[PDB]
Design an enzyme around this catalytic site. Sequence first.
Site, PDB file in Angstrom:
ATOM      1  CE  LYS A 152       3.784   3.941  10.098  1.00 39.45           C
ATOM      2  NZ  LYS A 152       2.364   3.624   9.776  1.00 39.45           N
ATOM      3  CG  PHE A 204      -1.813   1.215   1.297  1.00 39.28           C
ATOM      4  CD1 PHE A 204      -2.861   1.397   0.412  1.00 39.28           C
ATOM      5  CD2 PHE A 204      -1.593   2.172   2.275  1.00 39.28           C
ATOM      6  CE1 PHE A 204      -3.668   2.514   0.494  1.00 39.28           C
ATOM      7  CE2 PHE A 204      -2.398   3.291   2.363  1.00 39.28           C
ATOM      8  CZ  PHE A 204      -3.436   3.463   1.471  1.00 39.28           C
ATOM      9  CD  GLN A 205      -0.487   5.993   0.982  1.00 44.30           C
ATOM     10  OE1 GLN A 205       0.334   6.186   1.879  1.00 44.30           O
ATOM     11  NE2 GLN A 205      -1.566   6.749   0.825  1.00 44.30           N
ATOM     12  CG  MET A 215       7.442  29.397 -25.732  1.00 43.26           C
ATOM     13  SD  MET A 215       8.282  30.761 -26.559  1.00 43.26           S
ATOM     14  CE  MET A 215       8.612  31.848 -25.175  1.00 43.26           C
TER      15      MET A 215
HETATM   16  C1  LIG Z   1      11.448  28.925 -22.756  1.00 41.20           C
HETATM   17  C2  LIG Z   1      12.964  28.939 -22.467  1.00 41.20           C
HETATM   18  C3  LIG Z   1      13.835  29.613 -23.333  1.00 41.20           C
HETATM   19  C4  LIG Z   1      15.215  29.624 -23.066  1.00 41.20           C
HETATM   20  N1  LIG Z   1      16.066  30.283 -23.908  1.00 41.20           N
HETATM   21  C5  LIG Z   1      17.340  30.600 -23.444  1.00 41.20           C
HETATM   22  C6  LIG Z   1      18.198  31.650 -24.127  1.00 41.20           C
HETATM   23  O1  LIG Z   1      17.773  32.238 -25.105  1.00 41.20           O
HETATM   24  N2  LIG Z   1      19.461  31.945 -23.647  1.00 41.20           N
HETATM   25  C7  LIG Z   1      19.948  31.284 -22.540  1.00 41.20           C
HETATM   26  O2  LIG Z   1      21.060  31.549 -22.123  1.00 41.20           O
HETATM   27  N3  LIG Z   1      19.162  30.293 -21.879  1.00 41.20           N
HETATM   28  C8  LIG Z   1      17.846  29.950 -22.338  1.00 41.20           C
HETATM   29  N4  LIG Z   1      17.075  28.989 -21.699  1.00 41.20           N
HETATM   30  C9  LIG Z   1      17.607  28.283 -20.598  1.00 41.20           C
HETATM   31  C10 LIG Z   1      18.509  27.118 -21.081  1.00 41.20           C
HETATM   32  O3  LIG Z   1      17.702  25.996 -21.392  1.00 41.20           O
HETATM   33  C11 LIG Z   1      19.517  26.735 -19.938  1.00 41.20           C
HETATM   34  O4  LIG Z   1      18.865  26.752 -18.745  1.00 41.20           O
HETATM   35  C12 LIG Z   1      20.646  27.724 -19.906  1.00 41.20           C
HETATM   36  O5  LIG Z   1      21.091  27.992 -21.239  1.00 41.20           O
HETATM   37  C13 LIG Z   1      21.784  27.156 -19.109  1.00 41.20           C
HETATM   38  O6  LIG Z   1      22.435  28.213 -18.447  1.00 41.20           O
HETATM   39  P1  LIG Z   1      23.920  27.955 -17.877  1.00 41.20           P
HETATM   40  O7  LIG Z   1      24.563  26.786 -18.631  1.00 41.20           O
HETATM   41  O8  LIG Z   1      24.765  29.202 -18.102  1.00 41.20           O
HETATM   42  O9  LIG Z   1      23.862  27.638 -16.341  1.00 41.20           O
HETATM   43  P2  LIG Z   1      23.670  26.212 -15.728  1.00 41.20           P
HETATM   44  O10 LIG Z   1      22.668  25.427 -16.541  1.00 41.20           O
HETATM   45  O11 LIG Z   1      23.169  26.347 -14.286  1.00 41.20           O
HETATM   46  O12 LIG Z   1      25.078  25.426 -15.729  1.00 41.20           O
HETATM   47  C14 LIG Z   1      26.049  25.745 -14.702  1.00 41.20           C
HETATM   48  C15 LIG Z   1      27.405  25.258 -15.197  1.00 41.20           C
HETATM   49  O13 LIG Z   1      28.454  25.910 -14.473  1.00 41.20           O
HETATM   50  C16 LIG Z   1      29.140  24.907 -13.684  1.00 41.20           C
HETATM   51  N5  LIG Z   1      29.349  25.391 -12.379  1.00 41.20           N
HETATM   52  C17 LIG Z   1      28.452  25.439 -11.405  1.00 41.20           C
HETATM   53  N6  LIG Z   1      29.015  25.965 -10.312  1.00 41.20           N
HETATM   54  C18 LIG Z   1      30.322  26.266 -10.588  1.00 41.20           C
HETATM   55  C19 LIG Z   1      31.421  26.827  -9.877  1.00 41.20           C
HETATM   56  N7  LIG Z   1      31.268  27.213  -8.551  1.00 41.20           N
HETATM   57  N8  LIG Z   1      32.609  26.980 -10.502  1.00 41.20           N
HETATM   58  C20 LIG Z   1      32.755  26.617 -11.754  1.00 41.20           C
HETATM   59  N9  LIG Z   1      31.753  26.085 -12.467  1.00 41.20           N
HETATM   60  C21 LIG Z   1      30.537  25.898 -11.919  1.00 41.20           C
HETATM   61  C22 LIG Z   1      28.278  23.722 -13.664  1.00 41.20           C
HETATM   62  O14 LIG Z   1      29.075  22.528 -13.611  1.00 41.20           O
HETATM   63  C23 LIG Z   1      27.540  23.797 -14.934  1.00 41.20           C
HETATM   64  O15 LIG Z   1      28.288  23.177 -15.984  1.00 41.20           O
HETATM   65  C24 LIG Z   1      15.719  28.967 -21.945  1.00 41.20           C
HETATM   66  C25 LIG Z   1      14.840  28.289 -21.073  1.00 41.20           C
HETATM   67  C26 LIG Z   1      13.467  28.278 -21.339  1.00 41.20           C
HETATM   68  C27 LIG Z   1      12.508  27.543 -20.393  1.00 41.20           C
HETATM   69  C1  LIG Z   2       2.417  24.873 -22.405  1.00 39.39           C
HETATM   70  C2  LIG Z   2       3.809  25.465 -22.427  1.00 39.39           C
HETATM   71  C3  LIG Z   2       4.107  26.927 -22.428  1.00 39.39           C
HETATM   72  C4  LIG Z   2       3.048  28.033 -22.400  1.00 39.39           C
HETATM   73  C5  LIG Z   2       2.888  28.512 -20.962  1.00 39.39           C
HETATM   74  O1  LIG Z   2       1.726  29.327 -20.840  1.00 39.39           O
HETATM   75  P1  LIG Z   2       1.829  30.665 -19.983  1.00 39.39           P
HETATM   76  O2  LIG Z   2       0.539  31.439 -20.103  1.00 39.39           O
HETATM   77  O3  LIG Z   2       2.064  30.317 -18.532  1.00 39.39           O
HETATM   78  O4  LIG Z   2       3.048  31.524 -20.513  1.00 39.39           O
HETATM   79  P2  LIG Z   2       2.976  32.580 -21.692  1.00 39.39           P
HETATM   80  O5  LIG Z   2       1.597  32.587 -22.310  1.00 39.39           O
HETATM   81  O6  LIG Z   2       3.299  33.955 -21.160  1.00 39.39           O
HETATM   82  O7  LIG Z   2       3.989  32.209 -22.748  1.00 39.39           O
HETATM   83  S1  LIG Z   2       5.652  27.164 -22.453  1.00 39.39           S
HETATM   84  C6  LIG Z   2       6.317  25.657 -22.743  1.00 39.39           C
HETATM   85  C7  LIG Z   2       7.587  25.418 -23.149  1.00 39.39           C
HETATM   86  C8  LIG Z   2       8.529  26.576 -23.375  1.00 39.39           C
HETATM   87  O8  LIG Z   2       8.045  24.105 -23.365  1.00 39.39           O
HETATM   88  N1  LIG Z   2       5.174  24.606 -22.451  1.00 39.39           N
HETATM   89  C9  LIG Z   2       5.299  23.171 -22.248  1.00 39.39           C
HETATM   90  C10 LIG Z   2       5.119  22.783 -20.772  1.00 39.39           C
HETATM   91  C11 LIG Z   2       4.073  21.981 -20.410  1.00 39.39           C
HETATM   92  N2  LIG Z   2       3.908  21.630 -19.121  1.00 39.39           N
HETATM   93  C12 LIG Z   2       4.784  22.070 -18.172  1.00 39.39           C
HETATM   94  C13 LIG Z   2       4.593  21.672 -16.720  1.00 39.39           C
HETATM   95  N3  LIG Z   2       5.832  22.869 -18.530  1.00 39.39           N
HETATM   96  C14 LIG Z   2       6.001  23.223 -19.815  1.00 39.39           C
HETATM   97  N4  LIG Z   2       7.096  24.055 -20.174  1.00 39.39           N
END
Ligand SMILES: Cc1cc2nc3c(=O)[nH]c(=O)nc-3n(C[C@H](O)[C@H](O)[C@H](O)COP(=O)(O)OP(=O)(O)OC[C@H]3O[C@@H](n4cnc5c(N)ncnc54)[C@H](O)[C@@H]3O)c2cc1C
Ligand SMILES: CC1=C(CCOP(=O)(O)OP(=O)(O)O)S/C(=C(\C)O)N1Cc1cnc(C)nc1N
Lengths: 582, 582, 582
Positions: C171, C121-122, C485
Amino acid sequence: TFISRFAPDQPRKGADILVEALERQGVETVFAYPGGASMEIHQALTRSSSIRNVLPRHEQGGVFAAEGYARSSGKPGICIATSGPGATNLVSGLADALLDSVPLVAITGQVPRRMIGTDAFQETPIVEVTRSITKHNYLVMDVEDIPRIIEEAFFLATSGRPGPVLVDVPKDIQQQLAIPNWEQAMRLPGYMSRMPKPPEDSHLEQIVRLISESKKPVLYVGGGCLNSSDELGRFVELTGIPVASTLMGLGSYPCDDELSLHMLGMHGTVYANYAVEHSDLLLAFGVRFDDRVTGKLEAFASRAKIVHIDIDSAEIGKNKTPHVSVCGDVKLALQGMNKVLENRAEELKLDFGVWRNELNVQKQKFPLSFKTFGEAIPPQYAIKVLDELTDGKAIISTGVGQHQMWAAQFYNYKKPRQWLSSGGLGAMGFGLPAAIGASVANPDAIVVDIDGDGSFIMNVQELATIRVENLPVKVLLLNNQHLGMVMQWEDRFYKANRAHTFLGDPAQEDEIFPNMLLFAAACGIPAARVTKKADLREAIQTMLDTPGPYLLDVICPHQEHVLPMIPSGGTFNDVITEGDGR
Amino acid sequence: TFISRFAPDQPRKGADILVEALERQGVETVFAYPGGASMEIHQALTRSSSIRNVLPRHEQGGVFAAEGYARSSGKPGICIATSGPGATNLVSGLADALLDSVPLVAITGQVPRRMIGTDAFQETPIVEVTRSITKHNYLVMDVEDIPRIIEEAFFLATSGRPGPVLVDVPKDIQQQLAIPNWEQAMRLPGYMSRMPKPPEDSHLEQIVRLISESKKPVLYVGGGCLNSSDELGRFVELTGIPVASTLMGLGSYPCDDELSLHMLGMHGTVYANYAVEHSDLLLAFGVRFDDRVTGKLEAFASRAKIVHIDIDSAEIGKNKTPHVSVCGDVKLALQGMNKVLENRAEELKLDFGVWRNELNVQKQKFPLSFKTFGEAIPPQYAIKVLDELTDGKAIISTGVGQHQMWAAQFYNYKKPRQWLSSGGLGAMGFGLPAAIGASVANPDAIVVDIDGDGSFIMNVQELATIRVENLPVKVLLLNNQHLGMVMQWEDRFYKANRAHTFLGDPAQEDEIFPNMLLFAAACGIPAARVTKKADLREAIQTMLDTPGPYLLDVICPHQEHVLPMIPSGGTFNDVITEGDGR
Amino acid sequence: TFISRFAPDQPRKGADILVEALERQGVETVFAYPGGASMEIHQALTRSSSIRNVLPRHEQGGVFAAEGYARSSGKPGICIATSGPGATNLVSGLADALLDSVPLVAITGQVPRRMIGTDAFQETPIVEVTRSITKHNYLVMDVEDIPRIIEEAFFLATSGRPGPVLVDVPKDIQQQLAIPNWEQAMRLPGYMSRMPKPPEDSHLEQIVRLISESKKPVLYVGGGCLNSSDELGRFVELTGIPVASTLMGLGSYPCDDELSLHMLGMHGTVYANYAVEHSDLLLAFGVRFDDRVTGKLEAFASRAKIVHIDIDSAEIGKNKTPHVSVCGDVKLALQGMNKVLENRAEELKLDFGVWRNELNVQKQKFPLSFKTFGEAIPPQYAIKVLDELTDGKAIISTGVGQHQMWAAQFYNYKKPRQWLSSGGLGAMGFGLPAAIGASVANPDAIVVDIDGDGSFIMNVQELATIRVENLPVKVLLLNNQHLGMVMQWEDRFYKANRAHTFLGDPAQEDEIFPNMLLFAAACGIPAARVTKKADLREAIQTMLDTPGPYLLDVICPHQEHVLPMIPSGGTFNDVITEGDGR
Ligand SMILES: Cc1cc2nc3c(=O)[nH]c(=O)nc-3n(C[C@H](O)[C@H](O)[C@H](O)COP(=O)(O)OP(=O)(O)OC[C@H]3O[C@@H](n4cnc5c(N)ncnc54)[C@H](O)[C@@H]3O)c2cc1C
Ligand SMILES: CC1=C(CCOP(=O)(O)OP(=O)(O)O)S/C(=C(\C)O)N1Cc1cnc(C)nc1N
Ligand SMILES: Cc1cc2nc3c(=O)[nH]c(=O)nc-3n(C[C@H](O)[C@H](O)[C@H](O)COP(=O)(O)OP(=O)(O)OC[C@H]3O[C@@H](n4cnc5c(N)ncnc54)[C@H](O)[C@@H]3O)c2cc1C
Ligand SMILES: Cc1cc2nc3c(=O)[nH]c(=O)nc-3n(C[C@H](O)[C@H](O)[C@H](O)COP(=O)(O)OP(=O)(O)OC[C@H]3O[C@@H](n4cnc5c(N)ncnc54)[C@H](O)[C@@H]3O)c2cc1C
Ligand SMILES: CC1=C(CCOP(=O)(O)OP(=O)(O)O)S/C(=C(\C)O)N1Cc1cnc(C)nc1N
Ligand SMILES: CC1=C(CCOP(=O)(O)OP(=O)(O)O)S/C(=C(\C)O)N1Cc1cnc(C)nc1N
Ligand SMILES: [Mg+2]
Ligand SMILES: [Mg+2]
Ligand SMILES: [Mg+2]
């Protein structure tokens, strides 16, 4: 009360703790092969005055020796190897011990904890490798866990349905000084909760009830009855039910007995298979309904009310759905049913003489047979002579193939743990090392390895082990110059088209190759070769009478076939009774 | 344009499809051992007129032969086994091929698809078992997937960083009739996207830049340069940089050369280790920075600017953090850098004569040495004679231990794929079967197995294979009557306390046991034994001049130690240069 | 010196040991949701006078709150759930914490040890489930392992590259009385050996060297610099190199600064992407080269010498092969390079004014822009007003979608740990619960959830949590009545074909559905709605000035598009700069 070589407050190496942990388990003999990752263990083994080490010339020989040690004693077999190549050489033995449910504990050395996962020198994730071919395995991550894990290892390997348990020990753990705690509780809460408890009187008398209601019952005995020889024989007396045994269950009920149907199955006797085919009550005790016994399940005991008793709940209703099932030790189930049958002998008619005579007709109509061609030695006859000259009291280990079947057919094993053979995995090269382990476990016993030239040569290096350890191992080598069992399937299903089954030299066909006598001579073992049937009796006698190791190279015509035979996935009406490769 | 034995519209057995799939991969030789689950494959092998099968006497011998075949050719080695015991006998070879990055394809038979998971007869989840010790493995669930999987198997095994690939084939799939499609695309989108592309001119000239800026550079060559012999030598001419090679990289740069520092590492030469210790630029080409080479990583090339080139991105920055890294084929990286060095020879000073002479001092101060005691044969001397009498053109396969190191130290390998030895896993019993596979791949070549008595006996059964297949395999057996390498660690770290290292007979200590000559005689192989150093030259000559197989049992004093030696996890200032067990 | 609520020799429940283990880790706040398997833990939590529990209305809200707590503090976030449905409700948060490298410790209750594996269960094998989406996880099999595992859990979650660590507690373990040992050593020998040590002066001055040799450098800053705000800014002063930040690295370098190129990538500014495209030296500090930043890797920084610094060795050479690599803490790497730049300012010319002005042209030519249609509120404008009225000192948490990007573009974050958003996993419903955790970690701070109507409604139930816990959480809801989006990709790549993106009521299209104000009213939270741009300034002011929780429903035209945009797997010459859905 145990006596240690160390003070209760004295720091000891992990390796010393490991060895003492074995000493507290009553271990007298181990089969260890040294290497860099297990040197500390071997150093600690020398400091022990109770644990003897038999050094194999191959780790596969080491684990197979541990099996033969276990199979012929009931005690767990212990083999030790180093990391990497040493551990991977145990794999076949581990898988073999699992499928035949043999109690075995394997200890492998390992790289230091700091180096695990870096593909280091002689590193193999042996736990990851052997997880699916062991009952359970461990990776010791602290020297303090050694006494507990070893206790859990031996407990798991011997209790319930026996099996192989591997314990991987890092090198740095072996070197680390510590004070062991021997009174720590085992961490197996789930396993022990699922352990079968003694059978209820409810289930037992329902079975006894079915016995009286059926007048054509058959006992289906297997490897689960190896510790119930007395109880089974007592049960047969009270019932008079004919006994069909498996490859793994030979010796449980005396093969020479008049109620014995001998082996059933693919290469089982015709009258044994007939009994199960036309039974109305099947008493499946300590079996697992292998495909080599049932063939096509739907036809196997089609008109029989099936009763199944097993200590493993997973085997119940696995391949063949039973009517009545009792999960637990068959030894206790027999004892429970035995006390009922004698206290209730009056009410129960219990007379299957009509059914017994029906089978006894088949026992005379279709009996085990073999042909004698001129002066050529029939392999079936040679084994029968060995039976006579050893009075059926010799421990027999075999390889895998035609010789394996004949050794099981034409030798009347009187007691269990006398028949050592790979059934589940069916691994060649098992015969010779298993004989080694059995000879150590049973010094004063007659140990004979009935081997095939193909299987014998695989671990032939262990001949050196036999001489060095001065073991009276007898080798009855049945030489057909072929991989016979593979050759037999070629004659039957592939138009006798030879596909790499000849083991001799294609430059000198009628010369016996290789010269196995020189293999024995290389290891200082006296040997002889017999070709004519007339000299066979004296030759085997010489092998037995000559003290110490002996190799008898028995030359047999290769065209011989194991009979009878039921093709894979067939029924009783598909039994092959006559024919060979001539 | 391939020519099939079947019509494009004709239904064929799955086994026939499998064999033709091998034929289309250019396979000429396989190492197959028959069994019930792979009989259809062996039947189909006989129908082939291009694929030759070498039958081993043990599947471990089969896979090791496939390795030697692969290591001495560059072609992938193919071994075939049956289900259960056959497959588990391949495990050591698979793990060995993985750690040494050897291109190998293993095909194992399997129970019918309907029976997978029921612990059936001769069933082992070999895919589950070998997943962590293979580059990749497959379980064919349809006859139509055979041409694709086989293509993917050979592609994965040979491309990128080479490795073992296992293909498990169910019995019913082999029997099923079908029409194969050979033009189906491979399903490896992720693997091919991550495949390194040719090195940019950006990275290459930065390395060339560092070469001119450093005046004490050292080449760190390994098994990744086995296909870059020409490019590497050309690179050395343009630079004049001394070359340190690994156990796996011997022969890449000629060992007899004046710029050769020979082997570096635990048992590497002193001047090679000194070079890396006091280098300012380390050119690590085709290596993986094993602990047997580096010891303690923090001290390894502590003052050196490290340049690492590897086709595996996972090895870059794994154990030792590099300055400059180039992920790709070192063959192309050399070609790219070579064209730069010659077109830019004027601007670059490039003269490491001062650094070379500094090392040449060490090369004379601390050279490779051995003692000659009376008329007792020095194992180092025997190998040196073999070099002279074969002009360093003989393919050498070895076991594992003291003899393995001496064979790597005192033989000047002129070209790669001439040195066959287990380095990563370091598995004994590799020597003899590897010599078998190398002799088949290279018929007209001088093949010599420099083996130890412990390693030689493990797969001694393959002597029968050598005779049957009529292979001119030479066996230079260095007999010290001990597990020498284990014995050496005992003399050094365990007060010379013998823990199961003596291989002879404890009843006759000064008698050579076992008599290896009788092992050879058993398989119709001519053999001889030499004990005195005077007769050694003529004896080895006889071995070479005598046509076909030959075993020379060379008796050596066991007290010899492999020198120099750096204890596990040490530095360069911990090198042991003198001493033995006398 | 810690003060316990129990005597050192007094037996305590395992649950009490667990809580005290948290107290010794400095834990002040947990996010726990009660259930049968974790009742003992919640009972023990009440006995603690230091650990506060925030009760969510959903475990997903619980783990997301733990994230916001962690992201806005640097401290690890702790969430607790019961077995089965409770644990599976944490999954999204765990995977989210892994991809964004957020320090988090999750504790889940579990069925008694005796019942594990019986599908009780669970019961859910949460360890098996979360293994691939956590840094590491544990299954406590003994009450004595609690102090060690908890210590290892917090250590693994916070050290190296931070991540989620799950501890599954049976538990019966919680109920078992025992005396805890707090001085037992952690069993992480391999992990600690692989921990990066401080950067050598060797690597650092080579980077400084490359800085002077290149005259068009670009800083590539990410989430790895969240603890290096001071060191990074100091580094910029010494170099004058323009800074491009990622979604995860916002705030590290002040967005309002003149050297700031703001965000780069798919939805990054044009001038930031242009900088990387035409750079000759790329300083990648604390990044992982995500596809959302690079697009097609071969074109990303094609002519740039790439320098990569990361504390994770697995990220080095993963997607983009670097020239120079430094494995370690970027905080130390900056400090090391900073001391060099100031002590060597004379020799180094260091003047990238020409390159800076080249970028400053692009910064004015192609700047961030938005249109204002009549009195309709531009979502970009609303966020800009929030910036002005909070002086850029407000902690911002967002959902996922169009609003997420605009909140990252049009808000100038001055310091790190001010921008809380799901980047790696990009999980909706993150905004509101993350604001909850951030408000608890930072009581006196202005916390604003810039959410989308789609994301906001997913975990809308946590509005009750906000009121009950009396948290001053502000909700700036940008309502476009769509999944924006997803709608944007439809307008761009699918002919504006609406595929389930409208969130309103298809029976009353121009009525805002649902009425989010009534959601707030249901939880006693004051709320208001603004539609005209004129009232927007006063409305946001009211939200900020009104004490406690507040919801501002900002109505925006749905046809708005996030600009600029680079289609998945594209280059810089594929940037979309103009257009929408009108
Ligand atoms: C709708 C949407 C659109 C997006 N579009 C973009 C975009 O246009 N541009 C963008 O930049 N991102 C965008 N992203 C986010 C993208 O998917 C990633 O999250 C992002 O690019 C990763 O950022 P980062 O690698 O710089 O940092 P992180 O993902 O957090 O990576 C951290 C890195 O640094 C290292 N690190 C951590 N701590 C240390 C330390 N103390 N010293 C040395 N190294 C360390 C880690 O090992 C790791 O490799 C978007 C996300 C969404 C949801
Ligand atoms: C429906 C949806 C998005 C629309 C979200 O609706 P919102 O109303 O919250 O945001 P917006 O109109 O200002 O763009 S974004 C997206 C991406 C970038 O993959 N998804 C897929 C998605 C679906 N379900 C979850 C939990 N997270 C997600 N990112
Ligand atoms: C070439 C070849 C041919 C073969 N042909 C045949 C053949 O013709 N006929 C044949 O019979 N075999 C044959 N076999 C062997 C076959 O593959 C199996 O090994 C055999 O059928 C299994 O025997 P078993 O199930 O009775 O015993 P086991 O395989 O050992 O199974 C023991 C069962 O009893 C249970 N058990 C164990 N201990 C206890 C206990 N204390 N109390 C209660 N239950 C317990 C176990 O849980 C298990 O289920 C052949 C093997 C080879 C290599
Ligand atoms: C008893 C014993 C003692 C030993 N002592 C030593 C010793 O003292 N010194 C020593 O050197 N070894 C010693 N070893 C062997 C050691 O364990 C390793 O086998 C060896 O150090 C590894 O050699 P390697 O890394 O150069 O080659 P490999 O292990 O084969 O690694 C090859 C590397 O090159 C890369 N590569 C492969 N192909 C290409 C290509 N085409 N282009 C670019 N890159 C490629 C691969 O990705 C891989 O990273 C010993 C072994 C034994 C059994
Ligand atoms: C070659 C072979 C067999 C022939 C063995 O040759 P033998 O010479 O030893 O036996 P025999 O002629 O008297 O029959 S039996 C078999 C079966 C039943 O699967 N295999 C496959 C097999 C292959 N390899 C191993 C290690 N074990 C195996 N059982
Ligand atoms: C016994 C032994 C070795 C001794 C081998 O005996 P040999 O007689 O063959 O070699 P030698 O005396 O010339 O040194 S070496 C070794 C190492 C380096 O780990 N092992 C462990 C070992 C054990 N088993 C296998 C299959 N491979 C191994 N390498
Ligand atoms: Mg035979
Ligand atoms: Mg030796
Ligand atoms: Mg929306």
